[PDB]
Amino acid sequence: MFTINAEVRKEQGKGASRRLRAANKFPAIIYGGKEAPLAIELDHDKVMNMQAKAEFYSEVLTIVVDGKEIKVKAQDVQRHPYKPKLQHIDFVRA
Amino acid sequence: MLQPKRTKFRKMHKGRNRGLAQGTDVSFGSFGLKAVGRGRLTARQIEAARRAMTRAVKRQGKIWIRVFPDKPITEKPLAVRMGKGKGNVEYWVALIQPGKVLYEMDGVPEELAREAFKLAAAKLPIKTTFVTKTVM
Amino acid sequence: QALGKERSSLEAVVDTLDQMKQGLEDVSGLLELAVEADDEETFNEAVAELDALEEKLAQLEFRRMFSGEYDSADCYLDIQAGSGGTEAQDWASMLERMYLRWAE
Amino acid sequence: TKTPPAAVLLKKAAGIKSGSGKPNKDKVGKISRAQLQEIAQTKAADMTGADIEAMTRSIEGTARSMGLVVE
Amino acid sequence: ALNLQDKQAIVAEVSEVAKGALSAVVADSRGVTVDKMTELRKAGREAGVYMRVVRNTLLRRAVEGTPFECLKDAFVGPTLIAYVTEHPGAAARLFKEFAKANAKFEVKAAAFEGELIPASQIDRLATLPTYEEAI
Amino acid sequence: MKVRASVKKLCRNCKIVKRDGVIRVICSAEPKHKQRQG
RNA sequence: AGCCAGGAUGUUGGCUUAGAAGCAGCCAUCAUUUAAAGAAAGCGUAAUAGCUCACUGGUCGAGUCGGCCUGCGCGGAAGA
Incomplete structure (x- = not known):
């Protein structure tokens, strides 16, 4: 079990998403299966420590998003390209 | 000393060096030397640094060099009242952007490889870090 | 340092020469000791x-x-005729065809 | 006096005069475990192991170091 | 040095040896070189003495398992324990020739009949015979 | 005294101290290893 | 962290070397003793020895070890 909290995003785009990495969050997306894609945001430090462990990428994860649990796999991950950080994670629904 | 075998053109524009790198991931090996700043490795630099890390592992291991000096660079000789054409090609460079992986190693442990890439880093003009491979 | 070095030289000759007297007495013995049983x-x-x-x-x-x-190395050989006209120049050849026909 | 070194008594047992230049890759002899126990029991004045198998594994350590396999 | 789980292995292992043990001897560790320490443990495993040193706050957990809770005064200062499974006495002679031959250090107590016995009265455990006296 | 912009513990005995604005390396066991940062 | 004691046995591991005995260089991955100790961490011998750390029990009695990310600072820093 790897639990994550989130929030749905009000804003989006370059200006909005750069303000998130100023505030120690970062943006990600949940797509896949049937539904509309969902835009979410995550505490950076939480999910940095989790993705250290290589079970992050094998296992099924559990994103809480306004009460509703969702079960998702880590499909893709953009890193910031020298400092050890994260700029975005794609979460396919399983 | 690295240098293409043949090209189309002898001489090249100066260009600029903006933006971030392609070739950010450690693909070939376990560890790697990522650049953090932004400049040019000459070909003599790239070699001096290979000879450091090669010496330092005692030839265990395998080393990959991910960057190649394929831009040529001219200098005018001493006293040349400007003009009268572009200079001769003295030497070759790769351009480096923040995030390019430069060397990769595997077939050694992370004790030794940290020390090898520290001994390389002292020969290069740009600020560097050590990186391990990520699984995705 | 020099005395132990010189002992290391003189061991290599005196050990190897004495064990070839005793070693060719061993072989002349033990070939002939195979003939005594006669197999x-x-x-x-x-x-x-x-x-x-x-x-x-x-x-x-x-x-x-x-x-x-x-x-170890490869060598040159410079045969030169002396000082007596033709008879000397024949002797020089006579050699050349000697050192060639023994380097064969 | 003491019993002579374990390297000298393994050289007679294998049938060699000096050991291996690059050991464990290169191998320059052999010994069965009857001879390992005879070298163990001849050294049983010197050795600090209480039993035999304990003495024998000490002699196996010198055999690995000089190239000799334990056939 | 160790985990909380590795010290739980020692509480189970040393409590279990105390059941098999008839007699037991507390001693001292320091003073003595490994040549002369190993002379104690060679002649130890001839007479049948399971020699140990365990940590001395830790041994209050390991020797709760009865009747050797006598020996809780002794764990202030250094403690080479012993637990003699076969053959009663045995060790108490050998810890006094260990004491004399080096000529240092304390040698505190020796537990038999489920009771603490102080240093001058070990003469009874020291001049026990072999088991194996009546034949 | 060795004076140099990179001071470094050489032996295990060497100790880095800051005296009066300045990084030094005092070694007990080796007088050579005495260093200062200029 | 300090403080006291132990850091051994086959064995100078093997091979090289005038010598190489943990400690010039090269190859290497034992058990035994059990509190635990490298077939060797730094001084040092022509070589052993000598010292000493890893490692380990004793003593003592509350927080501590060292990486990552970020702010402001120190040295590096000599001219008429």
Whole structure:
């Protein structure tokens, strides 16, 4: 079990998403299966420590998003390209 | 000393060096030397640094060099009242952007490889870090 | 330092020469001790003692024979005729066709 | 006096005069475990192991170091 | 040095040996070189003495397992324990020739009949015979 | 005294101290290893 | 962290070397003793020895070890 909290995003785009990495969050997306894609945001430090462990990428994860649990796999991950950080994670629904 | 075998053109524009790198991931090996700043490795630099890390592992291991000096660079000789054409090609460079992986190693442990890439880093003009491979 | 070095030289000669007196008494013994029981297979298997002792003695010679740094290398040979007209120039050839026909 | 070194008593047992130049890759002899126990029991003045198998594994350590396999 | 789980292995292992143990001897560790320490443990495993040193706050957990809770005064200062499974006495002679031959250090107590016995009265455990006296 | 912009513990005995604005390396066991940062 | 004691046995591991005995260089991955100790961490011998750390029990009695990310600072820093 790897639990994550989130929030749905009000804003989006370059200006909005750069303000998130100023505030120690970062943006990600949940797509896949049937539904509309969902835009979410995550505490950076939480999910940095989790993705250290290589079970992050094998296992099924559990994103809480306004009460509703969702079960998702880590499909893709953009890193910031020298400092050890994260700029975005794609979460396919399983 | 690295240098293409043949090209189309002898001489090249100066260009600029903006933006971030392609070739950010450690693909070939376990560890790697990522650049953090932004400049040019000459070909003599790239070699001096290979000879450091090669010496330092005692030839265990395998080393990959991910960057190649394929831009040529001219200098005018001493006293040349400007003009009268572009200079001769003295030497070759790769351009480096923040995030390019430069060397990769595997077939050694992370004790030794940290020390090898520290001994390389002292020969290069740009600020560097050590990186391990990520699984995705 | 020099005395232990000189003992290391004089051991290499005196050990190897005394064990070739006793080693060719061993081989002349133990080939002939195969003839006393008189088996032709023990007669040929005790020859394996000798051809070990041959390339200890043949490598002690090679240590004297050649010695200086260049004695491995390829060589030139300059034959020159002396001072007596034709009779001397014939003698020079006579050689050339000697050192060629022994380097063959 | 003491019993002579374990390297000298393994050289007679294998049938060699000096050991291996680059050990464990290169191998220059052999010994069965009857001879390992005879070398163990001849050294049983010197050795600080209480039993035999304990003495024998000490002699196996010198055999690995000089190239000799334990056939 | 160790985990909380590795010290739980020692509480189970040393409590279990105390059941098999008839007699037991507390001693001292320091003073003595490994040549002369190993002379104690060679002649130890001839007479049948399971020699140990365990940590001395830790041994209050390991020797709760009865009746050797006598020996809780002794764990202030150094403690080479012993637990003698076969053959009663045995060790108490050998810890006094260990004491004399080096000529240092304390040698505190020795537990038999489920009771603490102080240093001058070990003469009874020291001059027990072999088991194996009546034949 | 060795004076140099990179001071470094050489032996295990060497100790880095800051005296009066300045990084030094005092070694007990080796007088050579005495260093200062200029 | 300090403080006291132990850091051994086959064995100078093997091979090289005038010598190489943990400690010039090269190859290497034992058990035994059990509190635990490298077939060797730094001084040092012509070589052993000598010292000493890893490692380990004793003593003592509350927080501590060292990486990552970020702010402001120190040295590096000599001219008429």
